[PDB]
Symmetry: D3
Subunit: 179 residues, 6 copies
C-alpha cells in the first residue's frame, strides 16, 4: 500500500508543472522534450489537464480531466480521464494519478500509481536542483519503484510558447451532447 | 408567418455578438458560460460563423457558414450550415437563422425560426440593459414563443480571450477537395 | 531527366515562403489566396512543413514533413509526407519535392517534380519582381512544363496573421505511439 | 391527433413485410426496388429491425430496434432507433413508428407518424391486391396525408435472397460495451 | 506461476468450442447467450479466431488471430490479437490466452491468464457434463482464481446458425496494405 | 497507344473470373490465393464489381463499380471506382480497366491500363491451359509490359465458397443519401 499525501491544496496545485523525469505512459511520446502539464480548476471542482511535449521539434498535446477517486477521502488519489484517439475522441480511458509527495511550497511533486508502472517527477522550474531531484527519486524507491532506467526529460533553456488556455479543441462537447 | 427584418446591413451585422439568452439547439452545450458568436463576411458574400461557449471552464467552438435562403429576397432569412461531427466533419447539417428584430444601431438582435424551437437574444455588450432585454423577450412572445423557461446565459465580468480569426481548423477543405 | 540544385543550404532554406504561382496538387485548395509555406528544421534533420492558404476567407492548413530522398546525394530531391485526412490522419501520402532553382540569396525558388504535374514558384516576398517571375517561369519551360494555364496566386497587401510554431495539431503522435 | 391501432399482437406482427409504397425517410434510398423489413422479437421484448432495399442492383440494409414509446399504453406507438453512419455507428437517431391500421389477419398495415412526413404501406405479399391498396391509401388521407406523389415501390416477381437472421454486423456491441 | 499444458496439438484444437462459463473480457458482451469460438489453422501456422455471442437476440462477433507467445516453447501460451473498434479497426490490442487444461480427447478446456482476471471453460458440446464442469472449476481454483461469481453462459437447445468461414469482414487487409 | 478490344459483349462478360496472374494494384493484397472477381450488370448499365482474395487463410473483399470511360466509344475502356477505406468509405478512387484481349468464347481475358503499371490475366477456369497462358503473356509484351516478375496467383483445387450476391455491405448508400 502506498503513502499518498493527505489534504492536498487543489487551488495551489494548479498551474504549470514541468516533467523532470518519467516512466512515460504507453501513449505519452517517449522521447519528449520540454514536457509540461498545465492544470486549471474547473467550476465544478474537477481539474482540466493539458499535457504537452515536443516530439522531434513539434508540439503534441492532449486535453483531459482529473478528479478525486473518492471525494470523501483526504488522500490525494486522483483519476485522470482522456477521450482517445484525439482525432476521433470516442473511447474514454482512465488511470490512477496519486500524489506521493509534495513539498510545503508546492514547488515539486512525485506522482505515481499502485501498479508501479508509471512515475513522474514534476517541478515548477524546468531546471530542478540536483539534491532535490535525488530526494524524490529516493522517495520513489521507498514506494517500491525500480528507478534504474529512469532518464531525465530534456528541458530547453527557455520554455517554448504555446496556448495553454483551457479548451476542448477536438470537439468532445459534441460527442457528449449526444448522450 | 413571422415578421423578419428587411434590408439587413450584412457588413454592419458582422463582428462579435454575445448570447444574452437562448433556447439552445440540440447540440449547442446547454449550460454554457460566456457564449458568443463571431461573424465575418467572406469574399463570396456568405458569412463565416464562429460560435464559442465555455462548458465547465473549457472553450468549445464550432465553425460554420451562413447565407441567404433566397438571395433575391430582402428578408433576413438565413440558413446556417455546419459539418459534423467536428472531429469527422462529413455530415452537412443546416437550419433556419431568421433575424426577427435588430435595432437601428445594430447593438442587439432577436434570432428565431419558424419552428419556434430555438431562439437567441444577442448583444454587442455581454451585459445587456434590463429594459432592452424585456422588450426583446416581448418581441419573441409576439412571434409565438413560450418564453417561460428562458434563462439568461451567464456572462463573466470580462470576456475570455480566444483566437477568432476565420479558420477551417478541422480540415473541411480536404473533404471538399474530394468532390 | 531534371536539373535539380546541388548542395542546398537546408538551414538557410527554412522559414516562410509565399507561393507566387502554382499548378496546385489535387488536394491543395485551388483558388487559394495568401498561400504560404513555413519550414522548420527538426532536431533529426528532417523538415517540418506547414502549408497555409485562405479559401473564401478562411485559413486552411496542413502539417507534414520533408526529407531527403537519398541522404547520400547532394541533389535537392526531397519527399514530402502527409497523413490524411487531416481529421482522421491514418493514410500516409508522399510525393516528390525537387528544388529546380534557387538564387544565391535564397529569395526565390522553383519547385517541381519529374511527373511535370505540379509546380510552385516561391518567394520570400509576397510581391515578386516581374522580371524575376518571368525568369523562373522560363526555367520551368526549360524543364518541360507547359506554363500556358499558370495563374498567379493572389496575395494580399499585408499577410494575414497565423500561428506558425511547429505543431502536431491533429494528434499524429498518438497514431504513431501505437506502432 | 392520429388514430393508432390498439392492442397490437407483437408476436404476430413479426416476420417479413414488403414495402408496397412509401414516402421514404431522408436516408432511406429513394429509388429502392424489392424493399422489405424483417422484424424479430428480442428476449427483452424490444424488436430487432432489418430493413433492406436494392439500389441499382445492390442490396443495402440497416439494422436497428423498435420499442414501445409508452409501455403502459395499448396504442401501437413505437419508436425506431438506429446507430449511424452504418460504417461508424456512433450517432443514435430515433423516430416515430405508428401502426395506423392493420387487418385482422396481419397481412397488410399502414405505418405513419404525427409529422405526416413519412408513410409506409406494408404487405406480407410483395404483390398487393389493388382494392386493398386503394383502401389503405384512403386511410392515409383520413389521417391527413397528401398522397398525390405517392409511388409504388417496384417489387420483382420473385424476392431476392438475403441473410435475414438477427445480427449486429457493424459492431454496435463494442461501442455499447464502452458505457 | 501457472501450469500451462505442454505440447498442444494445434490442428486438433481447431474447430468449434462453446463457452460454458466465463469471466468475460471488458469488451466481450456480458450477458451473452450461445457464445462460441471457431478456430482455423492459417497457412502460416497462426490461428484465425471467430468469437460469436448473441446479445438480446442479435449475433455479435469479432475476428482476430492467435499465435504462440514463444514459438520455441512447448507451453500452450498464446496471444490473441484484435483490431478495434470493429467499425474502424485501427487499434491493435493483444492479451494472454493460456490453455491451463485440456483432456486427452480435446473435448473440453480451461483457458486462463497470469493476471487471473479472465477465465473461460470451453466444450465441444454446448451442454457440458456436470461432474466435468466441476472438475474444471476446481482446476481454476488450483491456479488461484476466485470462482465465487462465475456464472454459466446460457446455451440454447440447438445452436444458432451463422457463417463461420474464415473472413476479414471489416477490411483489415486494406489498413495493413498501407504499411 | 494500346489496342483495346472493340464491341465487348457486356452481358456475356458478366459472371465469375479467376485471376490467373497479376501485377496487383497497391492496395490489392499481394500474396493472395484463390483470387477472383464477380461482375454483375446493374439496371442502369454500369457493372457491380466484387473482388475477393484469401490472405493467409481469410477472405478479404472489396465492392465497387465499373463503367464505360466514354459511352459513345466502342473501345472496351472502363473505369473502376471504389470507396475507401472499406471501413470508412468516404474517399472515391478510380482507375483504368482496359480489356486488351478476350477470346471469342469469353473464357479468358487480358486486362491492362495505359500506365503499364498493373495487369491481370483472367480465366473462367481457375486452372488455365498453359499454351493459352503463354499467349496472353505474349500479348502483354506486345503492349509494352515487362512480364519478367509476373507470378501466377495460387488457385486451390476447388474454389472456396462465399456469398457473391451484389451487395453494399459497408453502407455507401448512406453516405450517398447525404448528397
Ligand atoms: C507532467 C506530465 C504528465 C503526467 C503527470 C501524466 C500523467 C498521466 C497518468 C497518471 C496517466 C494514467 C496512466 C495509466 O495508468 O493508464 C496518463 C495517461 C495518458 N497520458 Fe499522460 N501524463 C503526462 C504527460 C503526457 C503527455 C505529454 C501526453 C501526450 C501529449 C500524455 C498522454 C497520455 C495519454 C494519451 C494517456 C492515456 C493512455 C491510455 O489510454 O492508456 N501524457 N498520463
Ligand atoms: C450566438 C450564439 C448562437 C446562435 C445564434 C446559434 C444559432 C444556431 C442556429 C439558428 C442553428 C440551426 C438550428 C436548427 O434549426 O437546426 C444552430 C445549430 C447548431 N449550433 Fe448553434 N448557435 C449559437 C451558438 C452555438 C454554440 C456555442 C455551439 C457549439 C459550440 C453551437 C453549435 C451548433 C451546432 C453543432 C448546430 C447543428 C446542430 C444540428 O446538427 O442539428 N451553436 N445554431
Ligand atoms: C508553398 C506552397 C506548397 C508547396 C510547395 C506544396 C508542395 C507539395 C508537393 C510537392 C506535394 C506532393 C504532390 C504529389 O506529387 O503528390 C504536395 C502534396 C500535398 N499538398 Fe501541397 N504544397 C503547397 C501548398 C499546400 C497547401 C496550402 C495545402 C493545403 C492546405 C497543401 C496540401 C497538400 C496535400 C493534402 C497534399 C497530399 C495530396 C495527396 O495525398 O496526393 N499543399 N504539396
Ligand atoms: C418497410 C420499410 C421501412 C419502414 C417501415 C421504415 C420505417 C422508418 C421510420 C418510421 C423511421 C423514422 C423516421 C423519422 O421520423 O425520422 C425510419 C428511419 C430511418 N430509416 Fe427506414 N423504414 C423502412 C425502410 C428502410 C430502408 C430500406 C432503409 C435503408 C436501407 C432505411 C433506413 C433508415 C434510416 C437510416 C433511418 C434514420 C434516418 C435518420 O437518421 O433520420 N429504412 N425508418
Ligand atoms: C470462447 C469464447 C472466448 C474466449 C476464449 C475469449 C478469449 C479472449 C482473451 C484471452 C482475450 C484477451 C483479454 C485480455 O487479457 O486483454 C480476449 C479479448 C477480447 N475479446 Fe474475447 N474471448 C471469447 C469470446 C469473445 C466474444 C464473444 C467477443 C465479442 C463478440 C470477444 C471480444 C473480445 C475483444 C473485443 C477483446 C479485446 C478487448 C481489449 O481490447 O482489451 N471475445 N478474448
Ligand atoms: C480479377 C481481379 C482484379 C482485377 C481485374 C482488379 C482490377 C483493378 C483495377 C484496374 C484497379 C485500378 C488500379 C489503378 O489504376 O489505380 C483496381 C484498384 C483497386 N483494387 Fe483491384 N482488381 C482485382 C482484384 C482486387 C482484389 C482481390 C482486391 C482486394 C480485396 C482489390 C482491391 C482494389 C482496391 C482497394 C483498389 C483501389 C486502390 C487505390 O485506391 O488506388 N482488387 N483493381
Amino acid at each position: 500500500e502506498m503513502e499518498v499525501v493527505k489534504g492536498l491544496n487543489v487551488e495551489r496545485y494548479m498551474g504549470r508543472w514541468y516533467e523532470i523525469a518519467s516512466f512515460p505512459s504507453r501513449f505519452q511520446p517517449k522521447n519528449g522534450v520540454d514536457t509540461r502539464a498545465t492544470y486549471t480548476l474547473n467550476p465544478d471542482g474537477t481539474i482540466h489537464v493539458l499535457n504537452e511535449t515536443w516530439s522531434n521539434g513539434k508540439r503534441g498535446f492532449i486535453e483531459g480531466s482529473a478528479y478525486k477517486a473518492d471525494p470523501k477521502s483526504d488522500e490525494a488519489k486522483l483519476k485522470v480521464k482522456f477521450y482517445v484517439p484525439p482525432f476521433l475522441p470516442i473511447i474514454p480511458v482512465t488511470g490512477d494519478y496519486w500524489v506521493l509527495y509534495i513539498d510545503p511550497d508546492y514547488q515539486h511533486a512525485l506522482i505515481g500509481q499502485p501498479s508501479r508502472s508509471y512515475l513522474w517527477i514534476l517541478s515548477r522550474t524546468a531546471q530542478m536542483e540536483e539534491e532535490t531531484y535525488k530526494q524524490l527519486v529516493e522517495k520513489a524507491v521507498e514506494e517500491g519503484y525500480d528507478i534504474s532506467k529512469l532518464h531525465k526529460t530534456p528541458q530547453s533553456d527557455t520554455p517554448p510558447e504555446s496556448n495553454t488556455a483551457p479548451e476542448d479543441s477536438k470537439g468532445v462537447w459534441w460527442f457528449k451532447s449526444l448522450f
